[PDB]
């Protein structure tokens, strides 16, 4: 009974409302505006600048206290759209309510994909692993306080920016930690300046938090003394000068058996530092392997920059998060020993979402009707298209969302792994 205009308007409205409503993590990630809009299906590798927190100077005279910096960049690739390609039955188009139900189901699937992507990247790139052999709970005798431990590790490592930290619990651990949902929505937010800016932590729960599979690696040792330096430029094959993604660092190990993207490692005799004062901390530095390049090579998501490296220039030494470089024959100390559902937390600007409008030519082809739309609350740009197919004697509907999530500053993303007792 609906007509084409009603189809487009109702579908776009329901998609926007649902996806805005049911994405808590996608709304806790910073929205980065792409540099420009282009009609190209292959989005450019957007190089996002990341700035180190700079302490405030005190004196009247501050000669040459701004020009000297390193200005590293990080790369995000938009990739290919998240789609939802289905057939529109005559039952759905019977009235507004059925059509809204069908479009709501489609939007829920799309928001599932978005929030799953954010959660999986946070869990597989988070590198502030805090571990305990006890399940999360409220009694201090045996249970583990995940929020307090996360607070103290994010305070010892001066990554907090003196502002709030976003915590995401899996629902069971959220129940165990004694967090109530009175006068709160389903995710634990307050319905209502930002609370994060004022410095108030936000504790939430999300069912999309993945299970970090155990690691079977045993006895892995490094091969040779390796030191990493924060470089801002590199020469590509054309001879031009290209940025370097300083997050990742390739480490040569004795073997990579039983190592995967989700694993967390911590080299023995290696400690963190406060990012501002560079004071050695008691906690061992924890890194996350992101890609197993070869049988003896590993990429870890925070680059270990030694404080004692004499080769470092002062601007390079400002980017120091590890006290000593990876000398030979250090053990890796696998941390995710057991299967456990992850609890993640990150700083203000530890995950960024980039989305740009989908290039299309509306009304150019009579058969297909495309309607661009955007979701301001989450920051996603999408498209809505419908077509008639004679094979199924029914109209095809397609909802595409183009977005690319990036884990800038993986050293500020934490993973909570309770029950790692084996």
């Amino acid at each position: 009974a609906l007509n084409e205009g009603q189809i487009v308007t109702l579908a776009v409205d329901e998609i926007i409302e649902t996806i805005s409503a049911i994405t808590p993590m996608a709304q806790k990630a910073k929205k980065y505006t792409p540099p420009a809009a282009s009609m190209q299906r292959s989005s450019n590798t957007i190089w996002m600048p990341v700035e180190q927190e700079s302490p405030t100077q005190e004196g009247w005279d501050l000669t040459d206290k701004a020009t000297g910096l390193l200005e590293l960049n990080v790369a995000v690739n938009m990739g290919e759209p998240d789609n939802d390609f289905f057939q529109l039955r005559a039952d759905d188009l019977r009235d507004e309510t059925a059509y809204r139900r069908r479009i709501q189901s489609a939007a829920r699937k799309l928001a599932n994909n978005v929030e799953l992507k954010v959660a999986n990247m946070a869990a597989e790139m988070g590198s502030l692993v805090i571990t305990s052999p006890d399940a999360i709970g409220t009694n201090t005798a045996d249970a583990w306080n995940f929020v307090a431990d996360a607070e103290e590790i994010m305070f010892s490592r001066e990554l907090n920016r003196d502002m709030g930290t976003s915590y995401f619990f899996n629902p069971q651990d959220y129940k165990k930690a004694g967090y109530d949902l009175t006068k709160r929505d389903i995710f634990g937010r307050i319905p209502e300046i930002q609370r994060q800016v004022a410095g108030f932590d936000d504790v939430l729960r999300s069912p999309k938090l993945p299970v970090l599979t155990k690691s079977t690696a045993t006895g892995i040792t490094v091969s040779g003394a390796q030191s990493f330096k924060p470089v801002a430029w590199q020469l590509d094959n054309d001879g031009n000068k290209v940025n370097v993604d300083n997050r990742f660092a390739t480490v040569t190990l004795s073997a990579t058996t039983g190592m995967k993207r989700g694993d967390k490692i911590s080299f023995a005799g290696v400690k963190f530092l406060g990012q501002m004062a560079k004071n050695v901390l008691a906690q061992d530095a924890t890194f996350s392997v992101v890609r197993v390049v070869d049988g003896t090579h590993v990429e870890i998501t925070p680059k270990p920059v030694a404080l004692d490296d004499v080769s470092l220039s002062p601007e390079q030494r400002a980017y120091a998060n590890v006290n000593t470089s990876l000398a030979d024959a250090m053990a890796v100390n696998i941390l995710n020993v057991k299967d456990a559902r992850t609890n993640v937390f990150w700083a203000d600007d530890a995950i960024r979402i980039v989305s740009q409008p989908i290039p299309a030519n509306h009304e150019l082809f009579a058969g297909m009707k495309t309607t661009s739309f955007s979701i301001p609350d989450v920051g996603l740009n999408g498209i809505f298209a419908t077509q008639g197919d004679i094979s199924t004697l029914s109209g095809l509907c397609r909802i595409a969302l183009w977005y690319g999530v990036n884990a800038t500053r993986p050293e500020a993303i934490g993973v909570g792994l309770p029950g790692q007792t084996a």
């Binding site: 007509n3 084409e4 205009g5 009603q6 487009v8 308007t9 109702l10 776009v12 409205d13 926007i16 309607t371 739309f373």
Partner: peptide
Amino acid sequence: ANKDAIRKQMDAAASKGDVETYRKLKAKLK
């Protein structure tokens, strides 16, 4: 009534195909 007029405007905007007007009128109604 105001509610009836706003709902009629929403229906007309939806039938036309203007998503932005429909969303603004829905916000006004709520």
